Amino acid sequence: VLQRRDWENPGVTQLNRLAAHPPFASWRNSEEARTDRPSQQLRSLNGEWRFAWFPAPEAVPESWLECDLPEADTVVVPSNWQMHGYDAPIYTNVTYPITVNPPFVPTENPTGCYSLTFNVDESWLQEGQTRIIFDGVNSAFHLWCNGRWVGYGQDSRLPSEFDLSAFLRAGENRLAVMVLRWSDGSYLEDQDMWRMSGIFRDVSLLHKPTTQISDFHVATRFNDDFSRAVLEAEVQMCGELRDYLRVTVSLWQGETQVASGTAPFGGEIIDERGGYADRVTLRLNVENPKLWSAEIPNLYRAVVELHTADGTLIEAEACDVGFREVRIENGLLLLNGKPLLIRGVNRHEHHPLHGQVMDEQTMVQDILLMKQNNFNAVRCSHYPNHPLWYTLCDRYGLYVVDEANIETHGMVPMNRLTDDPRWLPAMSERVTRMVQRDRNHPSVIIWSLGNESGHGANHDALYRWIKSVDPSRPVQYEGGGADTTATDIICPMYARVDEDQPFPAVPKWSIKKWLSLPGETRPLILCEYAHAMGNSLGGFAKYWQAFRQYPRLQGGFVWDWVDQSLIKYDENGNPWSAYGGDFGDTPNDRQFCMNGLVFADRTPHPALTEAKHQQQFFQFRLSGQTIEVTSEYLFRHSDNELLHWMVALDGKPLASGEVPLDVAPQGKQLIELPELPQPESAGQLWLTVRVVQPNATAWSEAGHISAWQQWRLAENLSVTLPAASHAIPHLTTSEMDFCIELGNKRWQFNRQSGFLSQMWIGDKKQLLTPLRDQFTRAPLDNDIGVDEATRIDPNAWVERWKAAGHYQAEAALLQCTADTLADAVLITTAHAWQHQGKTLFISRKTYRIDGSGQMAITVDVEVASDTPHPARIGLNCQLAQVAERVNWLGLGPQENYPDRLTAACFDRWDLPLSDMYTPYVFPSENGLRCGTRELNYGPHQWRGDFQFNISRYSQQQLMETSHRHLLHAEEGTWLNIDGFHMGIGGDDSWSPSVSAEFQLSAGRYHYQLVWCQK
């Protein structure tokens, strides 16, 4: 064992490991099997185990096999030992966490010694077979039972199983598991995620009779219109063949048996040597079957009884059966005859506390959120999941892409292993043992060959293996250019909608162009798109406009579901979110582990609502009085949906109402609105419709909003002049300052800087920092890309801004004059922002303070055409006032940006100040709200047509601080008011991704604001 070094041999991926197979419970009562109640023959060995850590496997003492070590501790299993503090988790993306020297791993290979003293019931050893199942061990392990070696296993994401029947004694028993952190297996586990290890999934003991169901496959085929099905169940036995032996496969819907078949063993003749005498295929006819889909996850129950002809049950197995067809026809992925539109998301198995250990609660939590936010599909990025995941997806209704635990991203070139026949054995085990495990789950609709491992001949062989073994499911794979011969689906990652990215060998064509390349017929579903890293998902709507226009663009899987942040603690025992490099870990890829639509604790990022809106299942058109509602549901009718409409003038409700939605799948409903009441005052009428689900479901609460849309109706422009003012403001001129006085209000303009330096209400200052122009933002993740202090990327927006000096450019005053008028004082200014002799921006302003006490600020900016386009064109100032609430008439309520505002609605919004800050773990520009016409904060009111954000953090603190928890609330409130703001992008987070139409490139910019106290 010490001598062999099997963890450094891709030829040895297991020793004495049993065959893979679908979930077994070995029920000895049919009814228990039918109802899926716990099985006395399936014991869990989860809980308190004994664990010790070692620098290498050589440093594991001989005594540990026979005796528990005193140094060892009592830990909970399943667990990742990094999460218990024993060593550091490593976050790396591409570059391997170990030296690239296949198949060799580091001599210093962290070794986790697990042990358990447990009882085996006598009954279990008198008859039948007792096996141990390790659902997840990262990354390789040797197993001993009662001091005797049992076997070895690799592949972190599939169960390893061993027969312990001859190793177990009655009474107390002891398992010894030596878990290696790195193995030849590691070379195929280079996923972009936290690198951890240990026994991290369930450990259990299964008892099976000596004569047993060893394997079983369920299949369902249909007639042309799905009105008749045939369930086909292949069952294989182990043990002695006997004439009295039978299998009954019976199909239940609730408590009704709908079909049943019983046959002896011995299948049809297969070749010249006969057939499988140890197998039987059962064929059941089902009339008018209830079809399975994510829309309506109709399940049947299938119970497979192994028994004597005379009626003695030997054992029962079972699975949920979902009657559905998955085929690709004429270039379209069809489910039950209908073209799918995949509203998907990639989801790693991550928990901020427990690491890579999963639990029902978290999984259920994830499914509900996904379904509540209009997702219908998930990708198992990039390994087979905890077995409960599929059960839940079967039951709640989600399309799953099941992915082999193969990623060799770090290799050079990416297919160095996958094109090497010597790695085919290791690879095949990762594909084949997956298929054997999950093939009966209806929620799995697509098989994937892994992730980011180039395209090698090994992929082609495995592709064909699956197509041969399971015709029911298309096979996809992205490596080597996303459209190789190893994929039934064009599945690129981060291909853009309109923009070609013609990388050599592996181009990412615009998805619209990709479909029509000469000879191409396949459907396109993006395996990864819209990289939700930090403040992101800009341009998301553009994907969905395309998905809907093009039949063969059948959607994609967002990257990704949840931030991979871990929980650390400070001096005071206060929790904070940690990313790459926060564990002494190096080389690291810092915050690249947080691309989630939700935080590690499952709190939504702002972007989640944008996804929810774009992935709506009802589309709307307006034509005068008529709302046309179109259903994008393929199967269900809108039987738990009513339309809630509201007409509002500038946030003020006028008319409302409800209509029940009665829409057939893919059908249309015309809702005729009543004659609307005439709005008195001036303003813009907005119509808002919402789709509300009256009844609670398995996945949502009563009143859950599933879709919404807005339209501008009538606008009555204000023509009424404000009534003339008695008072006239007084200019108090100085060498250094222009003061303007009216009532208790006082305005000061510094004649050396050119900016409003101060305002007074009564005799209290309102500003801590003068009102100045701003052309920069605290850079987003998308602004940064793969840019770091040691490796400069000159093309990332932040570097373009930096090199051009946007951040360090000083305002030179060109002009600052004062004029008194009939009813107003007029301050005129001009500033030039220069860096090293170049003039980047000229800002020409006028400040018109009149008798009403309302300062009308007019701003016109020239931006030099050869300077990189600025992040924003606006003003900032630090206010002295700190209010509890922020109130505005604009897009909201949540954070929105120019290329991410479709989900925001125009209305009157009122939130606490803290909600106006988005706590991105890597702090940046955040909290912006667009199309705002009025902003209120304490005694202040601004009016116009602007974008804004308001917080206790400066753009300077946001860009100088690496983690959210290190931010300190500054004195007063920083306000950012922008006439214009650059898009956030996020088609990926490693190249500039902001589309041309969201870049501030017009050259000349104009916006006007009205500042008044109310």
- Contact set with Na ion (CB under 5 A): 192, 547, 553-554, 592, 595, 959
Question: 574: annotated binding-site residue?
Answer: no
Of residues 249 and 935, the one with the C-beta less far from its own copies: 935
Q: How far is the CB of 940 from Na ion (least distance, A)?
A: 28
Q: How far apart are the first and last CA of the chain?
A: 81
**Closest listed residue to residue 852, CA positions, set 935, 729, 720, 761:** 729
Q: Is 997 known to be catalytic?
A: no
| Catalytic residue from among 315, 325, 403, 452 | 452
Asked if 1008 interacts with its own copies (CB under 8 A), we say: yes
680 catalytic per annotation: no
Ligand-binding site membership of 440 (annotated): no
CA distances from 83 to 54, 87, 600 (A): 16, 8, 15
- Least separation in angstroms between CB 478 and ligand IPT: 9
Count the Cβ atoms, other than its own, within 10 Å of residue 558: 31
Q: Is 271 in the site for its own copies (CB under 8 A)?
A: no
> Annotation-wise, does 226 bind a ligand?
no
Member of 601, 632, 662, 862 binding its own copies (CB under 8 A): 862
What's the closest the beta carbon of residue 540 comes to ligand IPT, in angstroms? 17
Cβ neighbours for 161, distance < 8 A, ≥ 6 positions apart = 17, 18, 131, 132, 133, 134, 206
Binding mask 147-186 for Mg ion (x = CB under 5 A): -------------------------------------x--
Using the rule CB under 6 A, is 535 a contact of ligand IPT? no
990 interacts with ligand IPT by CB under 6 A: yes
CB of 549 to its own copies, least distance (A): 15
Structure tokens at 393: 């997806």
Among 875, 905, 896, which Cα is nearest to 771's?
875
- Binding to Mg ion in span 449-468, by CB under 5 A: 452
276 binds ligand IPT (CB under 6 A): no
Contact between 20 and 428 (Cβ < 8 Å): no
DSSP character for 915? G
Q: Which of 409, 751, 806, 848 binds Mg ion (CB under 5 A)?
A: 409
273 contact, one of Na ion, Mg ion, its own copies, none, CB 5-8 Å limit per kind: none
Q: HSE, CB side, 13 Å, CA atoms: give it for residue 729.
A: 31
Q: Which strand ranges, in their side-by-side order, compose the sheet holding 332-335? A: 326-329, 332-335, 338-339
C-alpha span between 138 and 81 (Å, rounded): 10
Binding flag, residue 595, ligand IPT (CB under 6 A): yes
Q: Is 990 annotated as a binding residue?
A: yes
* Cα 83 to Cα 80: distance, rounded to the nearest angstrom: 5
**DSSP assignment string, 352-373:** TTTBT---HHHHHHHHHHHHHT
Segment 410-449, which members bind ligand IPT (CB under 6 A)?
none
Residues across the chain? 1014
Q: Is 832 in the site for its own copies (CB under 8 A)?
A: yes
3-state secondary structure of 611: helix
The Cα–Cα gap between 220 and 472 comes to: 9
Identify the sign of the CA torsion 487, 493, 498, 504: negative
Q: Which of residues 682-721 bind ligand IPT (CB under 6 A)?
A: none
Q: Select the binding partner of residue 493 from Na ion, ligand IPT, its own copies, none (C-beta < 5 to 8 A, by kind).
A: ligand IPT
How would DSSP label each residue in 849-869? EETTS-EEEEEEEEE-TTSPP
Which position among 349, 478, 528, 641 bears the catalytic label?
A: 528
Cβ–Cβ under 8 Å, residues 328 and 523: yes
Task: Tell whether 737 is in a known binding site.
Answer: no
Which range touches Mg ion (CB under 5 A), out of 63-71, 191-199, 507-515, 948-956? 191-199
Q: Is 531 annotated as a binding residue?
A: yes
Strand partners, 875: 773, 977
Q: Are 56 and 87 within 8 A, CB to CB?
A: no
Tokens of 973: 């409130």
Structure tokens at 247: 């299998």
Q: Is 192 in the site for Mg ion (CB under 5 A)?
A: yes
Sign of CA dihedral 30, 32, 34, 36: negative
Structure tokens at 786: 């793969």
Say whether residue 481 binds ligand IPT (CB under 6 A).
no
Report the nearest approach of ligand IPT to the CB of residue 526 (Å): 11
When asked if residue 725 is in the footprint of its own copies (CB under 8 A), the reply is: no
Which parts of 673-692 interact with its own copies (CB under 8 A)?
684
- Give the pair of three-digit tokens for residue 541: 């709507």
12 binds, among Na ion, Mg ion, its own copies, none (CB under 5 to 8 A by kind): Mg ion
Query: Nearest-CA neighbor of 860 among 841, 844, 842, 839?
Result: 844
The pair of three-digit structure tokens given for residue 825, joined into one six-digit string: 């004082």
| CB closer to its own copies, 352 vs 979 | 979
Q: Kindly state whether residue 724 participates in binding its own copies, applying the rule CB under 8 A.
A: no
Is position 528 an interface residue for ligand IPT (rule: CB under 6 A)? yes
Tell me which H or E stretch contains 466.
helix 457-469
As a whole number of angstroms, the longest Cα–Cα distance in the chain is 112
704 assigned ligand-binding residue: no
Q: Say which DSSP state 970 is in.
A: P
Comparison of 816 and 928: residue with beta carbon closer to its own copies: 816
Residues in 491-510 that interact with ligand IPT by CB under 6 A: 493
Query: Which of 162, 189, 187, 190 is CA-nearest to residue 176?
Result: 162
Query: Is residue 530 marked as binding?
Result: yes
DSSP class of residue 998 equals G
Nearer to Na ion, 202 or 295 (CB): 295
Residue 592 marked in a binding site? yes
- Which of 231/935 has CB closer to its own copies? 935
Interacting partner of 553 out of ligand IPT, Mg ion, Na ion, none (Cβ under 5 to 8 A depending on kind): Na ion
- Taking the complex as a whole, the smallest distance from the CB of residue 451 to Mg ion amounts, in Å, to 6
- To its own copies, the closest distance from the beta carbon of 734 in angstroms equals 17
> Interface with ligand IPT includes 192 (CB under 6 A)?
yes
Alpha-carbon distance of 766 to 19, in angstroms, equals 74
Which residues fall in the annotated binding site for Na(+)?
A: 192, 592, 595
Q: Which residues are catalytic?
A: 452, 528
- Contact residues for Mg ion, defined by CB under 5 A: 6, 9, 12, 184, 192, 409, 452
- Contact residues for ligand IPT, defined by CB under 6 A: 93, 192, 493, 528, 592, 595, 786, 990
- Contact residues for its own copies, defined by CB under 8 A: 684, 712-717, 719, 721, 814-815, 817, 819, 821-822, 826, 830, 832, 838-839, 842, 860, 862, 864-866, 945, 1003-1004, 1006, 1008
Which residues fall in the annotated binding site for substrate?
A: 93, 192, 452, 528-531, 595, 990
